[PDB]
Design an enzyme around this catalytic site. Sequence first.
Site, PDB file in Angstrom:
ATOM      1  N   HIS A  65      -0.833  -4.755  -2.873  1.00 19.29           N
ATOM      2  CA  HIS A  65       0.158  -3.719  -3.130  1.00 19.29           C
ATOM      3  C   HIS A  65       1.156  -4.116  -4.211  1.00 19.29           C
ATOM      4  O   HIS A  65       2.162  -3.421  -4.391  1.00 19.29           O
ATOM      5  CB  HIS A  65       0.888  -3.341  -1.834  1.00 19.29           C
ATOM      6  CG  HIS A  65       1.827  -4.389  -1.323  1.00 19.29           C
ATOM      7  ND1 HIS A  65       1.577  -5.113  -0.177  1.00 19.29           N
ATOM      8  CD2 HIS A  65       3.030  -4.810  -1.779  1.00 19.29           C
ATOM      9  CE1 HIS A  65       2.577  -5.949   0.040  1.00 19.29           C
ATOM     10  NE2 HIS A  65       3.472  -5.787  -0.919  1.00 19.29           N
ATOM     11  N   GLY A  67      10.886  -8.782  -1.812  1.00 13.47           N
ATOM     12  CA  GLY A  67      10.290  -9.700  -2.755  1.00 13.47           C
ATOM     13  C   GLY A  67       9.682 -10.939  -2.139  1.00 13.47           C
ATOM     14  O   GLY A  67       9.071 -11.734  -2.866  1.00 13.47           O
ATOM     15  N   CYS A  86       7.171 -10.930  -0.255  1.00 14.38           N
ATOM     16  CA  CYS A  86       5.741 -10.711  -0.088  1.00 14.38           C
ATOM     17  C   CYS A  86       4.957 -11.690  -0.948  1.00 14.38           C
ATOM     18  O   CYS A  86       5.334 -11.992  -2.084  1.00 14.38           O
ATOM     19  CB  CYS A  86       5.385  -9.272  -0.451  1.00 14.38           C
ATOM     20  SG  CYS A  86       6.302  -8.055   0.519  1.00 14.38           S
TER      21      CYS A  86
HETATM   22 ZN   LIG Z   1       5.709  -6.080  -0.492  1.00 17.23          ZN
END
Ligand SMILES: [Zn+2]
Lengths: 306, 306
Positions: free
Chosen positions: B41, B143, B145
């Site tokens: 994503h 952020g 991720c």
């Molecule tokens: Zn994310």
Amino acid sequence: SGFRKMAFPSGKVEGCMVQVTCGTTTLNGLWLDDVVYCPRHVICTSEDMLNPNYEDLLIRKSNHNFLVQAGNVQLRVIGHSMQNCVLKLKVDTANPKTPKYKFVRIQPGQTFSVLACYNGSPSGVYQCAMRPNFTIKGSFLNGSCGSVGFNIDYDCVSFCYMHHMELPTGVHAGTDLEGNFYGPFVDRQTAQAAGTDTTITVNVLAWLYAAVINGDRWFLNRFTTTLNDFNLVAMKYNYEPLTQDHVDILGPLSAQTGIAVLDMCASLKELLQNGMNGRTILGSALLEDEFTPFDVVRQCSGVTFQ
Amino acid sequence: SGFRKMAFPSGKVEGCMVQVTCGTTTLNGLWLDDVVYCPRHVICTSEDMLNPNYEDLLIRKSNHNFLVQAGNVQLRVIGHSMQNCVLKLKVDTANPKTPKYKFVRIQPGQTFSVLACYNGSPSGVYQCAMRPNFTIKGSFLNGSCGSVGFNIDYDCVSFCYMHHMELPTGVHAGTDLEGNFYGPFVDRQTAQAAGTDTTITVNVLAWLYAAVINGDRWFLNRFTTTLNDFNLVAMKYNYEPLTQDHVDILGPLSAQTGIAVLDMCASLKELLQNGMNGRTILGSALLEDEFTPFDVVRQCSGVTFQ
Ligand SMILES: [Zn+2]
Ligand SMILES: [Zn+2]
């Protein structure tokens, strides 16, 4: 979101840990530039620790009596000197992985990360606070002596603690990197008294602000209070008194949550007098004091290091 | 002595974290050999996350649409492919700091260390457990991720988790390094239900053994019990049932303390029915289930890594 007892990344420190061996004793040392730092009682036997004369013991030792292991590499001890309670073994090679570092003496209530090592090899990392009585409640086994505590400021490693011994009560005592003990402790195997351990009030308040930021609001109340009235209640439950400097450090947290410092104190007061009532705050049934106001802002904003 | 929520040293993982940017989104990636792994994503905008068609979205992107930052160095995306929920950006340079690594899919109740990163820079490290409902209660900001979870076996880094998103309830969900989500979660911004979270009974038992090893013995009692009688009480308080495999894993701890597994279960039963009574165990007023039997032995014996 979420809140965790977070430690600093230890990569910069792992490359500085070496194994120091003198005679039959082996422990960890910190290798920065061309100097190796380690507890001076590496020169002691189990019998010597009961009443050691470090000057006389060190005089029987020569540079070739110390064996420094940097994993698979050898470092030649060319010079040796004793600075307070630490040995400074000057080696021939400078550590290529020496980071931008700095020696600091922290104050009680400050937090730092510890890299527990055995035989010069990192074992684990955790975060803890310097208790008001200058002890730390850590996790150390035999041979962990020499393990260091540190903070990281963007790209600077601030070394603040070196582990020396476990007291008969199970708590841990150490020195700064200049060899000066934290607290009234000495490096010998004798019964030593640690002072009364109090709770770090300013840290608890920062932790309550972190709870509000993360959704825990039940402990907030319509009461207020003054600094004096709160302190008088704090000292009954063995809590550090709150000064104006503490209120100032909490300013930013007060502005982000819209909750005045003194309003939070009134909430803390009611928690001390009536308890938690089987409820939790950020997953804890006790009041946590191992987060400084600086730790809270950095975890709730996302500060990084290089 | 002492016991602490201990994380693995993160040095080997810090050298693998890079910043991945596609269009306007930026998150962390794991750079091993000449491949960069990151959540898929990263190709989505804030609007796309509500209902993304990853195949169609990825087809609009070419190799030069991805910007990979290894601190101050550049990596040229030569090939790109989607494996389940992770993107595999093949780069031109192989990471010189690639450690002996391995991809693993852990089971619920297992623990691992998380290195929280932002913009490809390590921020902190903590230890946590995979909940039985395949969530983790971590500390992640926007952020974060791409941050990964890992274990260390002497000299091998076992990567087991990559963070993908925060559920509306504040808990966190992610995938293994092959891109397969833990749990029934998908990588889109929608209301997703996490199952009932139960307590990891085997971990609690290991923690009680750690307490006995460290001096806390008050919870020991003259009672005993059977597996069935204990389980029936466990399920009333939302505790994982105990199997024979669990009893087997606790064998070593039973032999070191001289306390039979079933005798410890009887102690745990009384704790569940009557509570803690305002007392503590290893400094905790609640029962802790984020220590596996393996974590306990390694911290109480002094296991190291290289
Ligand atoms: Zn994310
Ligand atoms: Zn020692």
